[PDB]
Design a protein around this ligand. Structure first.
Ligand SMILES: NC(=O)c1ccc[n+]([C@@H]2O[C@H](COP(=O)([O-])OP(=O)(O)OC[C@H]3O[C@@H](n4cnc5c(N)ncnc54)[C@H](O)[C@@H]3O)[C@@H](O)[C@H]2O)c1
Ligand SMILES: NC(=O)c1ccc[n+]([C@@H]2O[C@H](COP(=O)([O-])OP(=O)(O)OC[C@H]3O[C@@H](n4cnc5c(N)ncnc54)[C@H](O)[C@@H]3O)[C@@H](O)[C@H]2O)c1
Lengths: 310, 311
């Protein structure tokens, strides 16, 4: 197929690009390098099945771009990703995550795109639900502008599906980690620990360390994107996680084990959600998707990546 | 109370201003005149409890405005309201209805505002619901960009409620009609029909006239805004309607009967985004708020016709 990936210069985006190319697709990458990195895509310099477009989804002529490249599927991973930044500037977050998505859908419905695969946020859209692991049927209850914008994006895409029959599905990842993750933000805690411990710099667990997340390896997430790109799961969100809860403290230990040396983090005052754990049954039933990579193994893979960057 | 009403130059907005003033409140109106009119407010030139601010919610310094006026409640009625334009330009619609709401909430949480009363869209947010009349517990399933932005608005306000304790409630009216409604607008059919038939000009329905809406008089809607402004219904939406369905065709007949003359609308192609049926369950507003609509359609239609006769 012809694929276009927004946020292609990013962690998950560049990984998806690699997978799509490996599957024999042509891939157009799109990014404004808000948080992305040229080094994430540099290996594709002489790959003729890949084309890169520098564009800001907020202001670029997405109509002209999609008219030119005629993607069959648009994989939408471009977003303002930082929860804290979304609180400091909800307008900016909403412009990128809501307006950006709307502009893309409006362009795609006019240019013969079959499907948009949106990226939601499994870790934040549910707020604090009464069910863990959390199924997609649980009500959204966003507690940050970031989370609200992700929900709004889902809803707008569902709307375009009604209006025009532009298909859509929402990939809602838990806590994604792995090679290429930027050691920054509360998202990149695996990267932060790996880089710091490898350096022998201090590491900080914010709170008593009991807070839990659902850690899913980037390759598993990418495979979900590929699966859902088909004519399946229309207008549906898919939780993409492992359905296992790992405490902040336990995560440190897993990274410490991989790195070697001391497992002795600093404990800081609490900064946020106490638990996150996704029910991944729908993805199995509908897409045949299961995560392949368990935490200890994934962390070793991730630490291996950071070893060579250090 | 110190109130601020966005969309104050508009149809429902100017009516709400009047009601709040009558109840003895201090009122700041705010509007950019996108679809509103200075003439909707001109009777307030010498009203000493009202001040007007010309401002765009998308671009103005709302922080500064709220900092000055310190409203306790913000009644948020400013919006792009045309479904057809929302289809033609979903970006602009989202800018006014989502970004505008976000900017207001961000300003409000910093300026000691107690509560924002949002205006959702009872008519459109449910899309095609599982049952009629439709309760608030029915899932949202917007089928136009306009409807999507309203849903998105509710969600962001709920979020700010969680984040900051900036209280909110969502008034979700059905088909609002009455004096001051734009007679050249999109779907304000009472106003469109009243003005046109009074003038002996053509009238149109979009589709085969069978589509139903739930027609609720502006004065009743405004009452709901006032009730909900207190410490009640935090985080909740309230359907504001009558729970009675009137077809486009029946609506036209009602107006023509009041006006006199022919009852013969043109049938045009249906509009992208329009729903077949709309009818709100208003049980929650009745129990929680004590709200009930007083004005029946025939009565309201007469009140509207007379407004357009003399204007
Ligand atoms: N990493 C996680 O744990 C996680 C989990 C759930 C959701 N997500 C979502 O996955 C997607 C990918 O995030 P990531 O972890 O790879 O982070 P990332 O920052 O590496 O990727 C986001 C990319 O989007 C680009 N981008 C941002 N604003 C843009 C704009 N206006 N125009 C064009 N490109 C723009 C950035 O430059 C960057 O390359 C995002 O939508 C994010 O919200 C990530
Ligand atoms: N009339 C109905 O049947 C109905 C039904 C349900 C919901 N609503 C909602 O009720 C509210 C009032 O609508 P109405 O029927 O009075 O229509 P209206 O057009 O008369 O009122 C909307 C007002 O908002 C103002 N406005 C628009 N964009 C603005 C911006 N960027 N900055 C500042 N002001 C801006 C307009 O100039 C206008 O005065 C809207 O939120 C609408 O979506 C109306």
């Amino acid at each position: 197929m012809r694929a276009l990936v927004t946020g292609a210069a990013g962690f998950i985006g560049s990984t998806l690009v690699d997978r799509l190319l490996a599957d024999g697709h042509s891939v157009v990458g799109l990014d404004n390098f808000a948080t992305g990195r040229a080094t994430n895509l540099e290996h594709l310099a002489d790959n003729s099945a890949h084309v890169f477009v520098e564009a800001d989804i907020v202001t670029a002529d997405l109509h002209a771009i999609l008219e030119q490249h005629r993607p069959e599927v648009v994989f939408h991973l471009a977003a303002q990703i930082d929860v804290r930044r979304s609180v400091a500037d909800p307008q900016f977050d909403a412009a990128v995550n809501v307006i950006g998505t709307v502009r893309l859908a409006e362009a795609a419905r006019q240019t013969g795109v079959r499907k948009i695969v949106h990226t939601s946020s499994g870790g934040s859209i549910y707020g604090t639900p009464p069910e863990y692991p959390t199924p997609e049927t649980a009500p959204t209850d966003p507690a940050s502008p970031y989370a609200a914008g992700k929900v709004a994006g889902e809803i707008y895409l569902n709307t375009f599906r009604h209006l025009y029959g532009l298909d859509c599905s929402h990939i809602a990842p838990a806590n994604v980690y792995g090679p290429r993750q930027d050691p920054h933000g509360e998202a990149g805690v695996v990267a932060i620990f790996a880089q710091a411990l490898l350096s022998g710099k201090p590491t900080r667990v914010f709170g008593d360390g009991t807070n839990t997340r659902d850690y899913v390896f980037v390759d598993d997430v990418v495979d979900a994107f590929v699966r859902v790109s088909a004519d399946v799961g229309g207008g549906l969100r898919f939780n993409i996680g492992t359905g296992k809860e790992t405490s902040d403290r336990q995560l440190h230990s897993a990274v410490a084990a991989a790195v070697g040396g001391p497992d002795d983090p600093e404990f800081h005052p609490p900064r946020d959600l106490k638990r996150s754990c996704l029910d991944i049954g729908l993805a199995e039933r509908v897409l045949g998707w299961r995560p392949q990579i368990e935490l200890a193994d994934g962390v070793r893979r991730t630490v291996e990546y950071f070893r060579h960057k250090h």
